Amino acid sequence: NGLKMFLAALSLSFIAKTLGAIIMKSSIIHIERRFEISSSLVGFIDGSFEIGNLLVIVFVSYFGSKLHRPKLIGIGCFIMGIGGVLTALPHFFMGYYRYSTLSTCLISPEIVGKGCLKESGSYMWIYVFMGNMLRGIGETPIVPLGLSYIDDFAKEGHSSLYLGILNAIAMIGPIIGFTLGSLFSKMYVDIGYVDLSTIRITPTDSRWVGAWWLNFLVSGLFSIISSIPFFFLTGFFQSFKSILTNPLYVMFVLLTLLQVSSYIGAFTYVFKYVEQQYGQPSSKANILLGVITIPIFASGMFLGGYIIKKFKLNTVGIAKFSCFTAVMSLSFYLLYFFILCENKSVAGLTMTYDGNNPVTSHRDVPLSYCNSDCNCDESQWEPVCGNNGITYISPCLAGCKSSSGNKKPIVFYNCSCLEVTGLQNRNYSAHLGECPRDDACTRKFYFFVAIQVLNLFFSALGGTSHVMLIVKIVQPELKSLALGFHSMVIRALGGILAPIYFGALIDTTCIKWSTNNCGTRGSCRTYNSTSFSRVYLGLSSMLRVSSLVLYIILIYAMKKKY
Ligand SMILES: *[C@@H]1O[C@H](CO)[C@@H](O[C@@H]2O[C@H](CO)[C@@H](O)[C@H](O)[C@H]2NC(C)=O)[C@H](O)[C@H]1NC(C)=O
Ligand SMILES: *[C@@H]1O[C@H](CO)[C@@H](O)[C@H](O)[C@H]1NC(C)=O
């Protein structure tokens, strides 16, 4: 086996690391309710893993490479597991979680105090922050160091094949993040301690929390086990300055920073896109997309390793091949622009309550007679779809005199608004929920998903290339640093900032906002279909088009150099 042994543990540590990222995300929403921690802190808690990993990555990489490489990664894994267990710990030392609106037509400081009053000098929130961040350090030596081992110790071109195999087997991590994470979400937090016949809260219930303790246990004990095979297996400034003074490398990391930022933004906002533009709430879509996506992405990465090795591509050749994927992954995006639908008809926001006129400003659409008398709470977002094909903000704002009730039929009757002038024979009724989007888009949505899958395959076929190219354009001794600085740049400036600035441009387009407590903009009830599609796709295509321009310069630069 030889190197294959190291490859075997490296695959195992990749599984552990990737499982670690998804498990925290799965429990991030569940953890807030039981812990009774502030949402702000909840974010700050996620910032913890980031600071761990991001803060020490540029050090572990550079310094670690001189030291024994098969042993250090092992420690990194052992740290990952310890952090996970430690994060599970509060449950061992804490107590049992003791803890309409028909809206038809008619004639936080506490939680914070709860979080703080119970502290009694030291609250449990510090344990989660002190522990999770540990996992970040555990992730630090997996990429910049382990890859620096295989790359330096491998066949002439197999490095590509091995790197493809690792990145295709690490996709089993999510696959095991969604089989147990959802399953263990179903299990109560104090399972085994309390008799589960008395717990009233249900997995669908808001009060119910997910079992964060078992969830981190599965991850910590997996990482600790994964670390067992590894054991058996003034210069800094200058290096950082030297890699940064390399013209080809800086262009390449800038290029990758821009592309990844675009891709990360696209990956995180596809679910708002599935829901807003076409109408799939994404509950069904996420499952369907996930089932198709994981095998196809893994096949894409595997083909990437195989093509590189089989064709015996050199640095310029892989640069070109990478660009080829860059052209193939952007030509597909151009097709998204053609796919856009028209806007959803929302009374009081995009159209008048009588349905006669489009509205230019969603600020202060006057009540129409049909809704003027109703003393309605304008803020409430309880959308009901009328038989006229027009959504209404609430049953009250639709003029619905009566509603069906707590019973299953969702129809609301005698709605003053939406009455079709001239056609009084037909009687009104507004089923709950937003109106479905028109069928042209529904047919189009499948095409959108198909092209998406094609783009994901054609961007995973060049996923292996991103790391493979970096090692070749950097000096044969500062390789570990390279995969560390770059791994920082992908995450610090692009992974951390992707949702923050994509979100902002997207946020401006919202027709309506949710007034959450003091905040009047807590959420967006509905994104304008035309504006959101125009900016989200535009931003993604623009960043990607800039990337192509860099590639051309990058490829021209290597061709001139060689
Ligand atoms: C819609 O409104 C009309 C007019 O208010 C309702 O008409 C009366 O409804 C009750 C029960 O049927 C009774 O007062 C009479 O049988 C109806 N005629 C009138 C005008 O008194 C009607 O029930 C409402 N529901 C609909 C039409 O779906
Ligand atoms: C409305 O009309 C339908 C027939 O189109 C009828 O079945 C239903 O009972 C009516 N409901 C009321 C009370 O308007």
Residue numbers in the entry: 25 to 123, 137 to 144, 154 to 279, 323 to 651
Article, verbatim:
OATP1B1, encoded by SLCO1B1 and formerly known as SLC21A6, LST-1, OATP-C, or OATP2, is specifically expressed on the basolateral membrane of hepatocytes. OATP1B1 plays a vital role in mediating the uptake of endogenous compounds such as bile acids, bilirubin, steroid conjugates, and thyroid hormones, as well as a large variety of clinical drugs including statins, antibiotics, antivirals, and anticancer medications for hepatic clearance. The interface between NTD and CTD of OATP1B1 forms a conserved cavity in which substrates bind.
Structures of OATP1B1 bound with bilirubin, simeprevir and DCF, adopt similar outward-open conformations as that of OATP1B1-apo. The root mean square deviation between OATP1B1-apo and each of the ligand-bound states is 0.51 Å (apo vs bilirubin), 0.46 Å (apo vs simeprevir), and 0.89 Å (apo vs DCF), respectively. In outward-open OATP1B1-apo/B/S/D, the intracellular gate is closed mainly by TM4 and TM10. A conserved salt bridge is formed by the interaction between D198 and K568. Particularly, the ICH is attached to the C-terminus of TM2 through hydrophobic interactions between F325 and aromatic residues, F83, Y86 and F87. This attachment potentially contributes to the sealing and maintenance of the intracellular gate in the outward state. MD simulations support the stable existence of both D198–K568 salt bridge and Y86–F325 hydrophobic interaction in outward-open OATP1B1-apo/B/S/D.
